[PDB]
Amino acid sequence: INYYKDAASTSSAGQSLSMDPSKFTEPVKDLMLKGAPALN
Amino acid sequence: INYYKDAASTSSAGQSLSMDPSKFTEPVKDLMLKGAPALN
Amino acid sequence: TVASISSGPKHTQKVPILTANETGATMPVLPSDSIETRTTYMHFNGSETDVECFLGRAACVHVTEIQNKDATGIDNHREAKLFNDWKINLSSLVQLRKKLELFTYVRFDSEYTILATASQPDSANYSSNLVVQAMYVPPGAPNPKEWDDYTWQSASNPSVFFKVGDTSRFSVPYVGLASAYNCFYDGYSHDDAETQYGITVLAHMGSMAFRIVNEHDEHKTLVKIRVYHRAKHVEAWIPRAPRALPYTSIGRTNYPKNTEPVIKKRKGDIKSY
Amino acid sequence: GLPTTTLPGSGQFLTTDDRQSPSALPNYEPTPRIHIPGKVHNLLEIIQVDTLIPMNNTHTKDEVNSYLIPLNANRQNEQVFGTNLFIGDGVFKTTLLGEIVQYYTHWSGSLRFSLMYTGPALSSAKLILAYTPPGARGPQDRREAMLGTHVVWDIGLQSTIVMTIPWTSGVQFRYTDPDTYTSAGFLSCWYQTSLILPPETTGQVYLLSFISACPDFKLRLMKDTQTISQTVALTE
Amino acid sequence: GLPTTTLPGSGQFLTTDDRQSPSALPNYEPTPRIHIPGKVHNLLEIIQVDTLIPMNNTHTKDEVNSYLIPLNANRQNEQVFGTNLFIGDGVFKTTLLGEIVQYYTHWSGSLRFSLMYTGPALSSAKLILAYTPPGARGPQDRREAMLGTHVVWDIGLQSTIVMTIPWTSGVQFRYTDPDTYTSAGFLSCWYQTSLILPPETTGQVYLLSFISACPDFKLRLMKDTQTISQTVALTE
Amino acid sequence: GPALSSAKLILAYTPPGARGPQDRREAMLGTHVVWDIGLQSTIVMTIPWTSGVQFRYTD
Amino acid sequence: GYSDRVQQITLGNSTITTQEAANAVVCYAEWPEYLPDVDASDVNKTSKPDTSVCRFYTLDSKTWTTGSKGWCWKLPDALKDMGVFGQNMFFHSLGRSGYTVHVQCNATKFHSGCLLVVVIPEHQLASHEGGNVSVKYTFTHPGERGIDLSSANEVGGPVKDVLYNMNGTLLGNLLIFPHQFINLRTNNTATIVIPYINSVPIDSMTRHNNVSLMVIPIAPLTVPTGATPSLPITVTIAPMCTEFSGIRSKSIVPQ
Ligand SMILES: Cc1cc(CCCCCOc2ccc(C3=NCCO3)cc2)on1
């Protein structure tokens, strides 16, 4: 129950439960498959 | 009504109403019947 | 539920009262196996003997003390009780301890209540109103050194601010590393020849630290902190023999030497009533 | 803003109340539970396991010997042991039953008292155990004893005898700390015929005695035990 | 007026509680969000990116050189480097992994340790990396090392080798601040055959080493880092 | 022995490759049976066929 | 014609027969079983030597005399040197096991005496010094020899006082632990099956013992006239469902 009118006044947000490290761990242009050779 | 998000914050648990003394009072391998001889 | 059924005379070849205790069992014998009984009902559930109930009331687990005074020229705040800490543990005060050690492994959430009262043992014009700031300092966190260190910023560490005379209350989930807390541990932290033996190795849960936020007034004020602990959501495994001798140390089973006989000697014979 | 009124008791801390609290560690994930044999749910589960009674209390420092009730060969008519039934005191007090009863104020229910015989296999004996319900004195001779709850025990292949002290009471609860109005009786044991040892054998034989509670049992109104105290906080 | 009672804890301020508050700026409209690449949702997302370990810690002032593990041509049987696995201390401590682990009290999971070789292309080498699970000492020679988790690495076209320290543990969580009971093992590396440089070439070659966490990883119970402190408030 | 006596013996079979055992500790690590002397008067130990080669010489 | 009385336990390449048993106890009514995945944490596949480790090892014999106070063995310590069980033990980082314990003591129908055979999960011993003196490693790792409660206090060792279970609790209440009596007049062996009991799924076998087996004379031994005044007690123990994990170099432990 929100007792207040504005959105800033609500409690903390709830877990992204998004999670996708590939923008950080695999930003390569041509896709690399694990097990296939790195450099062909 | 829980007012809080986490489970630790809820009140005391409610009675097991489990109760089974046999693990402590009769841990024998071959079942003993009351009234039958203890050692055959 | 019947507590006793009706039972009459018996002249059998089936004797429920003769057993062999060498087997390790406690055979479930009842009044009606050996006298003539009448029906009676239980009228009772055994509610208040549930382990949740047994370990579920607040017990005092720790009393410490800090003072508000001018820290000017104090070389060791910790030592002046300008703030103090507590190496969290539940085995220091021994009423709650005997209760928990009826079990080998125990798992529960904790609810802490902290009461703080002030004393002014020497001449003051008044009673000041102090705010305490007890903060949890887990293992591997910058321990605080003065009563007003960067540590107290506590940007990542849960801390509660309440007023002396009031009470603070909050609840911490089961923080054990394993599946249960060991009430006992017959091991070492590693196979060294001189490393400590017990749980003390095990149950190093970090310490709790208290301080007054207020600067000093003209008089000095003693604040004494009492921490209460209530187990909620209790789970206990493997019952053990109750503690008979007195305790000597947090975390070891050791009893004092030249202790006194714990079994009351008869005033009379074996035959005495 | 909703109008409220606070009642007497506001702000009090009652160590026995059960309410919700904020978690200091929001979002923390506890270690998974694994399976461990032995879970206890009720103290009523464990007081049904029998444990030994230091019946032979007559020593002067605690010894393994106060668990042993001695028996003499060839005595007739005589008395083996006697005790009142204040389960919260005296012989009972250090037993697991005694030890738990002491966490509660009131108890009601039947008790199971058993004796296991340890004499040579080629010996024989007949004993009588008697329960005397409240109201009479501890019996003074078997004649007196045999008129109340009793079992003639014949020592045989079957080594233990289980006597039950059936709940005999006006009032439905008794105090665990000894009280008169609330008192439960006496338990005595006498030779029914007599212990007889085989040839080439000699001396005393002993009985071990246990106590546990019947499924009948009720304990209520928790309190603090006289069995443990302290003068300064312990440290590591 | 509805009757209420206030409980213990009323009026306290717990820095970790999460409740509603009045907005000081009623009706204000925040700037629209535009799209920005790079959003982070979990610290678990970032500790999977590998970063360099200053393994060569032997210097006396911080230098680019403590990131370089040197290799010597023609040595046989010998040891390239050694370290314990207290991820919250020592070599690990300044790495991103080390640096985040320090915001939490407990960690569990697998680690990924990789080595990238930088020697001339016409050289060759075979190294063995070994993980020694808790309970034994840091290995003292390859024979000792090779009996635990290990990978023979053959230096080739493929420049990096990824070793995983699989989670080997009784207890399901370890402390990030170094603790004995909770300790994780050792990591060592030895020549399997030996580094060989081509003609016209000379000197030391170096390996770069990285650390990142497997998707396996768990961190819990947030706390304050020993890695930052201050004596007076900063100003502009 | 007399019926009123009692005894517990261990019989041990030691498969080829080790020496005749020199003490029970050594003996008890191979095929063995703890025999408890009772009402049942005989104990039957089996020397199970332990062998690489499927036949042995009688001489 | 099956009696509670006669029994045969065959485990591996070793068999035990008793013609005078008194049933058998299975701790907490649970039988040893391997570690399920749902309970697993370490990612390593475990090693299950099976029949080479799950057989019966008979420890060296003790001698019950009228002055005996009782003996105490710790598990897995007592087996630290038995065959391949022991090797596996020193060579893996973690291991887990249940056991069948068979304690043997026969006499005649003229003897009297009664031993308590009990298994105590997590038996943390007390220092006889009091205070917070610790009990050194070696002292709680006696090996097959076990601890002899009638031996003298030593320095850094545990207290050996029997009415207190070596920990501040009374002998009389040991009956809350899985146990069985050996009463010469009834019984000649005691058998207890121990499931693996711990707060973690698998642990170290050298830094932590998870049960102490204790044999304590309670009704003193009384031999027939002009009999030799003593009887030997033998303990045979078999690991069951053993699993080892995290193999490597081979632990080196104090002393
Ligand atoms: C058995 C047993 C019992 C214990 C204690 C466990 C409790 C977990 C840690 O306790 C606290 C205490 C205080 C705080 C706190 N946070 C803000 C103020 O106080 C947090 C956790 O450890 N083993």
mmCIF file of N, CA and C in Angstrom, chain A residues 1-4 6 8-13 15-16 18-21 23-25 36-40, chain E residues 18-23 25-28 37-42 44-46 48-50 157-159:
data_model
loop_
_atom_site.group_PDB
_atom_site.id
_atom_site.type_symbol
_atom_site.label_atom_id
_atom_site.label_comp_id
_atom_site.label_asym_id
_atom_site.label_seq_id
_atom_site.Cartn_x
_atom_site.Cartn_y
_atom_site.Cartn_z
ATOM 1 N N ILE A 1 0.780 -1.281 0.000
ATOM 2 C CA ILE A 1 0.000 0.000 0.000
ATOM 3 C C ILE A 1 0.788 1.294 0.000
ATOM 4 N N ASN A 2 0.710 2.084 -1.043
ATOM 5 C CA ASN A 2 1.520 3.345 -0.958
ATOM 6 C C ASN A 2 0.712 4.326 -0.163
ATOM 7 N N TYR A 3 1.228 4.982 0.840
ATOM 8 C CA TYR A 3 0.432 6.009 1.552
ATOM 9 C C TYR A 3 0.576 7.406 0.976
ATOM 10 N N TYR A 4 1.541 7.509 0.101
ATOM 11 C CA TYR A 4 1.947 8.796 -0.460
ATOM 12 C C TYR A 4 1.764 8.843 -1.957
ATOM 13 N N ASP A 6 3.558 10.612 -4.461
ATOM 14 C CA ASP A 6 4.672 10.701 -5.397
ATOM 15 C C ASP A 6 5.431 9.435 -5.507
ATOM 16 N N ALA A 8 8.599 8.937 -5.647
ATOM 17 C CA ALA A 8 9.935 8.922 -5.012
ATOM 18 C C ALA A 8 9.699 8.448 -3.610
ATOM 19 N N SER A 9 8.405 8.384 -3.289
ATOM 20 C CA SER A 9 8.283 8.202 -1.786
ATOM 21 C C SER A 9 8.124 6.785 -1.467
ATOM 22 N N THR A 10 8.105 5.943 -2.465
ATOM 23 C CA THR A 10 7.917 4.469 -2.270
ATOM 24 C C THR A 10 9.203 3.819 -1.840
ATOM 25 N N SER A 11 9.094 2.605 -1.334
ATOM 26 C CA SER A 11 10.296 1.948 -0.769
ATOM 27 C C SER A 11 11.116 1.409 -1.929
ATOM 28 N N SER A 12 12.180 0.744 -1.501
ATOM 29 C CA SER A 12 13.256 0.285 -2.417
ATOM 30 C C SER A 12 12.634 -0.556 -3.515
ATOM 31 N N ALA A 13 13.344 -0.638 -4.643
ATOM 32 C CA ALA A 13 12.838 -1.317 -5.790
ATOM 33 C C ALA A 13 12.733 -2.777 -5.864
ATOM 34 N N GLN A 15 14.195 -6.917 -6.992
ATOM 35 C CA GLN A 15 15.449 -7.357 -7.668
ATOM 36 C C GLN A 15 15.301 -7.558 -9.175
ATOM 37 N N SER A 16 16.212 -6.727 -9.793
ATOM 38 C CA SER A 16 16.316 -6.659 -11.219
ATOM 39 C C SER A 16 15.983 -8.063 -11.795
ATOM 40 N N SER A 18 17.733 -9.171 -13.494
ATOM 41 C CA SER A 18 17.973 -9.065 -14.960
ATOM 42 C C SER A 18 19.203 -9.895 -15.286
ATOM 43 N N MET A 19 20.387 -9.432 -14.956
ATOM 44 C CA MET A 19 21.593 -10.250 -15.086
ATOM 45 C C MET A 19 21.999 -10.774 -16.429
ATOM 46 N N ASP A 20 22.873 -10.077 -17.129
ATOM 47 C CA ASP A 20 23.404 -10.474 -18.407
ATOM 48 C C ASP A 20 24.809 -9.900 -18.602
ATOM 49 N N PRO A 21 25.752 -10.709 -18.202
ATOM 50 C CA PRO A 21 27.146 -10.258 -18.203
ATOM 51 C C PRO A 21 27.654 -10.171 -19.600
ATOM 52 N N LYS A 23 27.358 -8.200 -22.018
ATOM 53 C CA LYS A 23 27.833 -6.891 -22.566
ATOM 54 C C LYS A 23 29.235 -6.571 -22.080
ATOM 55 N N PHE A 24 29.621 -7.061 -20.935
ATOM 56 C CA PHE A 24 30.913 -6.891 -20.287
ATOM 57 C C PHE A 24 31.833 -8.044 -20.595
ATOM 58 N N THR A 25 31.410 -9.265 -20.592
ATOM 59 C CA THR A 25 32.357 -10.393 -20.771
ATOM 60 C C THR A 25 32.598 -10.834 -22.181
ATOM 61 N N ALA A 36 35.440 -24.146 -29.855
ATOM 62 C CA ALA A 36 36.013 -23.851 -31.197
ATOM 63 C C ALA A 36 37.273 -23.035 -30.929
ATOM 64 N N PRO A 37 38.219 -23.084 -31.835
ATOM 65 C CA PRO A 37 39.436 -22.304 -31.761
ATOM 66 C C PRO A 37 39.133 -20.804 -31.628
ATOM 67 N N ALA A 38 39.871 -20.129 -30.810
ATOM 68 C CA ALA A 38 39.764 -18.672 -30.638
ATOM 69 C C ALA A 38 40.086 -17.944 -31.925
ATOM 70 N N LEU A 39 41.225 -18.302 -32.498
ATOM 71 C CA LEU A 39 41.637 -17.575 -33.760
ATOM 72 C C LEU A 39 41.781 -18.672 -34.814
ATOM 73 N N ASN A 40 41.070 -18.519 -35.847
ATOM 74 C CA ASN A 40 40.909 -19.380 -37.009
ATOM 75 C C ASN A 40 41.804 -18.751 -38.112
ATOM 76 N N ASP E 18 13.557 -0.526 4.964
ATOM 77 C CA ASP E 18 13.112 0.047 3.672
ATOM 78 C C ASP E 18 11.646 0.431 3.739
ATOM 79 N N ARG E 19 11.362 1.677 3.960
ATOM 80 C CA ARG E 19 9.973 2.131 4.121
ATOM 81 C C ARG E 19 9.660 3.354 3.263
ATOM 82 N N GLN E 20 8.379 3.780 3.334
ATOM 83 C CA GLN E 20 7.946 4.957 2.547
ATOM 84 C C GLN E 20 8.205 6.246 3.321
ATOM 85 N N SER E 21 8.344 7.354 2.700
ATOM 86 C CA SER E 21 8.585 8.653 3.230
ATOM 87 C C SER E 21 7.849 9.676 2.421
ATOM 88 N N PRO E 22 7.505 10.745 3.059
ATOM 89 C CA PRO E 22 6.896 11.881 2.258
ATOM 90 C C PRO E 22 7.919 12.447 1.290
ATOM 91 N N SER E 23 7.506 12.826 0.074
ATOM 92 C CA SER E 23 8.427 13.519 -0.854
ATOM 93 C C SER E 23 8.486 15.003 -0.481
ATOM 94 N N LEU E 25 9.564 17.430 -2.455
ATOM 95 C CA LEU E 25 9.229 18.028 -3.700
ATOM 96 C C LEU E 25 7.971 17.366 -4.335
ATOM 97 N N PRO E 26 6.836 17.704 -3.777
ATOM 98 C CA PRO E 26 5.565 17.174 -4.285
ATOM 99 C C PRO E 26 5.426 17.724 -5.707
ATOM 100 N N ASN E 27 5.077 16.799 -6.552
ATOM 101 C CA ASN E 27 4.730 16.968 -7.916
ATOM 102 C C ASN E 27 5.717 17.282 -9.000
ATOM 103 N N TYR E 28 6.918 17.198 -8.653
ATOM 104 C CA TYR E 28 8.104 17.483 -9.473
ATOM 105 C C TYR E 28 8.260 16.411 -10.513
ATOM 106 N N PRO E 37 24.338 2.893 -23.185
ATOM 107 C CA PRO E 37 24.841 1.500 -23.206
ATOM 108 C C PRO E 37 25.438 1.193 -21.853
ATOM 109 N N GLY E 38 25.670 -0.033 -21.449
ATOM 110 C CA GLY E 38 26.327 -0.399 -20.269
ATOM 111 C C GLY E 38 25.664 -0.573 -19.011
ATOM 112 N N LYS E 39 24.373 -0.769 -18.857
ATOM 113 C CA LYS E 39 23.679 -0.832 -17.540
ATOM 114 C C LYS E 39 24.121 -2.057 -16.785
ATOM 115 N N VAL E 40 24.367 -1.865 -15.486
ATOM 116 C CA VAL E 40 24.778 -2.983 -14.574
ATOM 117 C C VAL E 40 23.614 -3.339 -13.702
ATOM 118 N N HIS E 41 23.267 -4.578 -13.470
ATOM 119 C CA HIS E 41 22.195 -4.848 -12.548
ATOM 120 C C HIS E 41 22.716 -5.541 -11.298
ATOM 121 N N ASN E 42 23.633 -6.437 -11.387
ATOM 122 C CA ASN E 42 24.118 -7.208 -10.249
ATOM 123 C C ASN E 42 25.621 -7.082 -10.154
ATOM 124 N N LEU E 44 27.256 -9.367 -9.522
ATOM 125 C CA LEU E 44 27.639 -10.721 -10.030
ATOM 126 C C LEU E 44 27.858 -10.586 -11.513
ATOM 127 N N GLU E 45 27.293 -9.555 -12.153
ATOM 128 C CA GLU E 45 27.535 -9.471 -13.600
ATOM 129 C C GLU E 45 28.967 -9.093 -13.883
ATOM 130 N N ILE E 46 29.471 -8.140 -13.117
ATOM 131 C CA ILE E 46 30.814 -7.633 -13.372
ATOM 132 C C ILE E 46 31.930 -8.484 -12.853
ATOM 133 N N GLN E 48 32.519 -11.369 -13.329
ATOM 134 C CA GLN E 48 32.835 -12.404 -14.324
ATOM 135 C C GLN E 48 33.726 -11.854 -15.410
ATOM 136 N N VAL E 49 33.958 -10.579 -15.478
ATOM 137 C CA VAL E 49 34.962 -10.007 -16.432
ATOM 138 C C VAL E 49 36.337 -10.219 -15.819
ATOM 139 N N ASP E 50 37.302 -10.728 -16.569
ATOM 140 C CA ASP E 50 38.613 -10.989 -15.890
ATOM 141 C C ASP E 50 39.449 -9.710 -15.925
ATOM 142 N N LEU E 157 49.441 -21.371 -30.676
ATOM 143 C CA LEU E 157 48.757 -20.340 -31.431
ATOM 144 C C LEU E 157 47.735 -19.675 -30.545
ATOM 145 N N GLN E 158 46.959 -20.457 -29.931
ATOM 146 C CA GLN E 158 46.022 -20.091 -28.836
ATOM 147 C C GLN E 158 46.877 -19.699 -27.641
ATOM 148 N N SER E 159 46.782 -18.377 -27.391
ATOM 149 C CA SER E 159 47.677 -17.707 -26.461
ATOM 150 C C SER E 159 47.370 -17.870 -25.009
#
